Amino acid sequence: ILAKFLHEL
Amino acid sequence: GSHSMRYFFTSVSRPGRGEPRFIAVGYVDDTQFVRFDSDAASQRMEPRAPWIEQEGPEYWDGETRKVKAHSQTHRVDLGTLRGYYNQSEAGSHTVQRMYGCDVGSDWRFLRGYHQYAYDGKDYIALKEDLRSWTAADMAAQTTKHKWEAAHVAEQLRAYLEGTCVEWLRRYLENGKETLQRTDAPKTHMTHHAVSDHEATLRCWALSFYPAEITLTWQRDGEDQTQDTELVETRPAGDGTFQKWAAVVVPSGQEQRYTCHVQHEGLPKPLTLRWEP
Amino acid sequence: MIQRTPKIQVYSRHPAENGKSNFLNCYVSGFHPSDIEVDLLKNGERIEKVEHSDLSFSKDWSFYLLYYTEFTPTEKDEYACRVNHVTLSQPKIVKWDRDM
Ligand SMILES: [Ca+2]
């Protein structure tokens, strides 16, 4: 499964 | 023995007001199991292996939500990076991201990854302790500082050591008939005259899985790189891989050369000699 | 910016046997950026039904793709992959060799 969220750069 | 789950994301900007293209693919070991492509008709995460199709609508709905959210993050990031590098709107630029986890023979966590690139070069990556970052340049240092302040590494670490490993184990189980197989290379050698005083010997490894393989030529038992050629390992298209290595030799001296093959599928390295 | 020209291999899925159905592959790899055009050719003419893999990339961030189509090799017919990319002045044509 993919990560649940990513932080912007 | 060991296994990995990896996701690969590419985002490409298009000039002016064109929207960026976003592609996501996921792999267990060397087997692709899902894909998303923003240009494609479905606008959904799609299966690419038979064993993932048994996941129900909740899986596909959740993964499609998440992959869309991933694409939105990369859209913003393309904008941020354009400013950081002082670039115009006229050109196309590319962000790539890879993340995932490896497990050992016992299926316990071995290592985790999260790497990011801009315009084909390393931008920032998570170090192996999963607590600290390596930044390529001044722009990436800005991102490092923001990600430090926001405790991003701690959040990733939870994913890489927890969720990633658990789902990898589930996939390994559900896809056991095809993921837990190794296919040893079928090997052979071919020979062709290249003049009246030289000949090519080519050592072939076919139909193997996983992709990692080593082919090496020896002359009288001594490693030989002079006058050899090795191609990149390549997909056959049916889930296995192919590779060859070749050496140019004096005519009549073919028997001095051996090709050596190492692969997880072989209980011992193979040695081949031109046998016709 | 780090740009890279494509490596190209042209090959069959199975060992070629003349008059037996098989798949002709063109594997393009090592390239950056990702936009690429690939044509599979029989005796210089485009082959009509060609499929391709999903874009992915390698450990050095360079991209790779497989293009493939059904074909039945014979001793006489010439097969080739023709590739265009921003790094190239003109399209590169690689001819199929059944022992490569
Ligand atoms: Ca745009």
Residue numbers in the entry:
A (entry chain C): 1 to 9
B (entry chain A): 1 to 276
C (entry chain B): 0 to 99
Show me the paper's own sentences about this structure:
Recognition of peptide-major histocompatibility complexes (pMHCs)5 by the clonally expressed αβ T-cell receptor (TCR) mediates T-cell immunity. Combined with biophysical analysis, we demonstrate the molecular mechanism for antigen discrimination by the ILA1 TCR and model the mode of cross-reactivity with these APLs.
To investigate how these ligands adjust TCR interactions to tune affinity, we solved the structure of four APLs (A2-ILA3G8R, ILGKFLHRL; A2-ILA3G, ILGKFLHWL; A2-ILA8T,ILAKFLHTL; and A2-ILA8E, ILAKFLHEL), included our previously published APL structure (A2-ILA8R, ILAKFLHRL), and used the ILA1-A2-ILA complex as a model. In both peptide variants, the mutated residue was at position 8, distal from this structural rearrangement. Closer inspection of the structures did not reveal an obvious mechanism for this indirect effect on peptide conformation. The structural rearrangement that would be required for ILA1 to bind to A2-ILA8R (KD = 151 μm) was reflected by a much weaker affinity compared with ILA1-A2-ILA (KD = 34 μm). Both A2-ILA8T and A2-ILA8E ligands underwent a conformational transition compared with the other APLs. However, the position of peptide residue Phe-5 in A2-ILA8T may allow for compensatory interactions with TCR α-chain residues Asp-91 and Tyr-98, which are not present with A2-ILA8E. Furthermore, the smaller Thr-8 side chain in A2-ILA8T, compared with Glu-8 in A2-ILA-8E, would require smaller modifications in TCR docking. Taken together, these structural distinctions may explain the extremely weak affinity observed for ILA1 binding to A2-ILA8E compared with A2-ILA8T (KD values >500 μm and 28 μm, respectively).
